[PDB]
Design an enzyme around this catalytic site. Structure first.
Site, PDB file in Angstrom:
ATOM      1  N   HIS F  18       0.908  -1.294   0.078  1.00 21.10           N
ATOM      2  CA  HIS F  18      -0.059   0.109   0.085  1.00 21.10           C
ATOM      3  C   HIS F  18       0.788   1.418  -0.032  1.00 21.10           C
ATOM      4  CE1 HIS F  18      -3.137  -2.755   2.057  1.00 21.10           C
ATOM      5  NE2 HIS F  18      -3.545  -2.446   0.925  1.00 21.10           N
ATOM      6  N   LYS F  42     -16.819  -7.961   6.323  1.00 25.96           N
ATOM      7  CA  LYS F  42     -16.271  -8.769   7.481  1.00 25.96           C
ATOM      8  C   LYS F  42     -15.613  -7.801   8.258  1.00 25.96           C
ATOM      9  N   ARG F  91      -1.792  -6.155  -9.029  1.00 26.45           N
ATOM     10  CA  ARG F  91      -0.544  -7.227  -8.541  1.00 26.45           C
ATOM     11  C   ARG F  91      -0.567  -8.362  -9.498  1.00 26.45           C
ATOM     12  NH1 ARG F  91      -3.101  -7.301  -2.702  1.00 26.45           N
ATOM     13  NH2 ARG F  91      -4.602  -7.646  -3.892  1.00 26.45           N
ATOM     14  N   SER F 129      -3.121  -7.723   2.640  1.00 24.75           N
ATOM     15  CA  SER F 129      -3.199  -7.476   3.975  1.00 24.75           C
ATOM     16  C   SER F 129      -3.724  -9.060   4.850  1.00 24.75           C
ATOM     17  CB  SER F 129      -4.220  -6.493   4.529  1.00 24.75           C
ATOM     18  OG  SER F 129      -3.769  -5.425   4.185  1.00 24.75           O
TER      19      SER F 129
END
Ligand code: F0Y
Ligand code: F0Y
Ligand code: F0Y
Ligand code: F0Y
Ligand code: F0Y
Ligand code: F0Y
Lengths: 158, 158, 160, 160, 158, 160
Positions: F18, F42, F91, F129
């Site tokens: 990040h 979540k 990514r 993460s």
């Protein structure tokens, strides 16, 4: 009468192609197996040879007609009165390219519907290019081709 | 003695290839680095040049043998008494093509096992084609090639 | 070289796809540890004791397989078992992406552990324990995809 | 040939992407069953009764569509309905991978059921019922992606 | 003044390329549309023709400059004082190849930042290659090209 | 041109991946809003207050970054902040598919917001993460992937 067209270069027709055209004949009343002249791909077999091999390999299927063409795909489908275009699925690169062709064909002939079929697991990893590469290095490709095609391929490389 | 074969065109061998062959030597007792003549791909370097460059680049690894071949892959693996075929992973297109080759090789030689290794993040975005394209436009490729290969590439383009 | 390889997973339950991969691994490495995760994030259909006993019976014919439960980080367990080879199966593109992200992480955690990817038979390329369980739960035939002992245990689990 | 085709899903709720696919299917097959899953694993936003009534009103203009709820394995329901064609939409690569795994499973379960994949209009290629619901829940405009009756029902559901 | 470069072969420039360069002009003060000579790809149109077609097609956008180049991409970006390289997204194969080029360019020019933009859904399935293939078989491609480009393509094939 | 760009996410917690993306964004746009989702579906490991304070300390060296919490639809927040550029990191292939579906949705919601995709350093291409948290929870070393303040906060969270 529901008419479908199964187009490609079929250089040469393999058991994967036989599997797809067989599945198409179980769904549609008449299936045209359409072979593109494809001079830009520099095919191994002439168009006349590819049509003759495919006619022999599909002779046992009563509702298949093998034809050669050099026209734009969408024009040839319209001129054969077909409203369904059959494609076989294989790899991601093929799928993404099939999506581009289907969106282009929708602009050229909106009523022509692209239909994708999945080959048997048995033929899901083969292509005309792969079979030819193996055969050029003398590898046994009898399992992947109709009998008449295997003889023609061996003769062409001899 | 467990024998593995690491095949490819290696035109020219890069640091990505050195990374994969090094990882293979840590796992198997003897590794054959096998260079295909590949005339259809019109290589930049002759087979004799590619074998000599790879021999120099791998000389520090005691259990690597560099050999050239023009045979069918599966036949050459059988004839080298190898039972493991090493491949490096990179992109989706490569992976899908590796799956086709592995299923074909399983039909040609069932006991030959395809083993995929992952290169260091450092070399995960390079290929012989990309390095050559950069070098043809005079870009610095010293970081991506063994010293002897970098000199040979500069000399070939000069 | 006397290589020790680890083949980790949840094996909930072990399928013919898992048997295919572990059989290929035994044909190239001297000793293979079939490592079963004790406590996955989602509650498994089969308890660890059931998963271990099913995998043991289904791999009993392979003399160089050891079935072992583990609760640590996979790389911490591999290091303590002196494994230098990590075995994973690659079925399709979805597997390829996820496995490459895990392999870079495992290389950071244990650089001496080499990730080796094998390809299953075409027969098992589209199956997973999740798909088999879902089909069986909704009254579909999955006999072909499982070892006999697993077929029996899954039928008994779904009956209650 | 008098072909019966099945187009299964959760349709929670039916979107313009689903309407596009079912419309194309009616243009090639004599009868299309729009089959709605009664009990998905995750609790749906709309009850089966709401999902069925929304799909019926949104497909009423297509004379050869039948909307039907089902709770069995999709292939068990297709076999009992005498369907020989299974319709699925292919939006992108993620769809391609998952659909190929389901198609090999369905071919094992019911070999006489042929999976046929259609492509939606570019207009609906990036949408799913999940994305539409998420955008609408967070106060985004989704009117363009839904039939009018579904737009009205979704607004009423989110108001309470 | 923030300067961006939009490079490619543009053989010929399509409405997909016009869409991407238009989006880039809304973000950066000056956009260089850079056309590679690309002799290895054997282009249909000469570099001079591709530059002239792109200049006419982008004349309505005041902050676009069309230039031809034969240099290494990273060198040409440095020499134009650009710090942003614009790419359009399309398929997985393109994306994976763009990731390799971006990592290579980062080694050649660390301050040059690769920026990917998404074309309108309208042009998300077209390419210069696909348009040329359709046009070579006389299919209508008026919807996919600027007016001047469509006339030039028809004339080239005539 | 005085461009305002938005870089949204859950940042649970912010990683070096990040930091890499936001640093690149500050090098091309005048002002960057690092926008943190207040209430993800979540339950996050770190509360919004913790996520904001961690991101602020980790980006304090970049003078043109503003860290801000938001609970609306991302496009509604971007419109109210006068952002015309939306920053996302790409990514791998899984990112590419999902991001293209979100970008077409965001273009429908706010046509004046242009999605710009950046590529992180090879060093952070395989991390998320979620993966970092999973490795750390199972006693793996993740120090290399996090800013020092985040490493300290994650150790404290996992200790209890
Ligand atoms: C949905 O499927 C397809 O649309 N196509 C494309 C055709 C392709 C067969 C083929 C190969 C080589 C040349 C041709 C030549 C004829 C000769 N010779 N015609 C032709 N090229 C085309 C390229 C793109 C499009 C949209 N239309 C085309 N029409 C055909 C099978 C899969
Ligand atoms: C699992 O890996 C592989 O199987 N292969 C394929 C070979 C390839 C090296 C290569 C390149 C160019 C030509 C050849 C020529 C020899 C020369 N000159 N032999 C050859 N071609 C083949 C194509 C397909 C298959 C299944 N077998 C083949 N055998 C080899 C590395 C990756
Ligand atoms: C190369 O493959 C893998 O690396 N993994 C990951 C593990 C996974 C098996 C598994 C499932 C559920 C929990 C665990 C628990 C133990 C228990 N109970 N340990 C564990 N979780 C992890 C998540 C990520 C990583 C990098 N390492 C982990 N180690 C293991 C097979 C595929
Ligand atoms: C070719 O497409 C599909 O095959 N499927 C799968 C079904 C799915 C619809 C659905 C959702 C939730 C539950 C069900 C339940 C009924 C209820 N309630 N039946 C059911 N689950 C399945 C999972 C896998 C397979 C192979 N078969 C299944 N059959 C159905 C659309 C896409
Ligand atoms: C991030 O984007 C890119 O980096 N590139 C690559 C270039 C490419 C345009 C192009 C096409 C054909 C030849 C060239 C020639 C010039 C001529 N004539 N220069 C050139 N080739 C290259 C190949 C790789 C790399 C890293 N750098 C290169 N530089 C350029 C657009 C996308
Ligand atoms: C281009 O990227 C994105 O568009 N998104 C989506 C947002 C996401 C951050 C996030 C996570 C959890 C909840 C939210 C909530 C706010 C809270 N709390 N807002 C929100 N949810 C959305 C889901 C889809 C779309 C199109 N827009 C949304 N806006 C945001 C980063 C990646």
């Amino acid at each position: 009468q529901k008419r479908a067209i199964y187009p490609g270069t079929f250089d040469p027709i393999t058991n994967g192609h036989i599997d797809i055209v067989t599945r198409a004949t179980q769904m549609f009343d008449h299936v045209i197996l359409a072979i593109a002249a494809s001079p830009s791909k520099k095919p191994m077999f002439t168009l006349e040879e590819r049509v003759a091999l495919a006619q022999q390999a599909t002779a046992h299927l009563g509702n298949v007609e093998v034809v050669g063409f050099s026209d734009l795909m969408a024009n040839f489908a319209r001129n054969q009165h077909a409203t369904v275009l059959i494609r076989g699925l294989r790899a991601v690169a093929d799928f993404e390219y099939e999506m581009q062709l289907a969106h282009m064909n929708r602009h050229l002939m909106p009523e022509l519907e692209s239909v994708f079929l999945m080959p048997s697991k048995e033929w899901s990893f083969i292509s005309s290019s792969l079979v030819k590469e193996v055969a050029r290095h003398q590898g046994d490709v009898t399992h992947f081709l109709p009998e008449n095609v295997h003889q023609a391929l061996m003769a062409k490389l001899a």
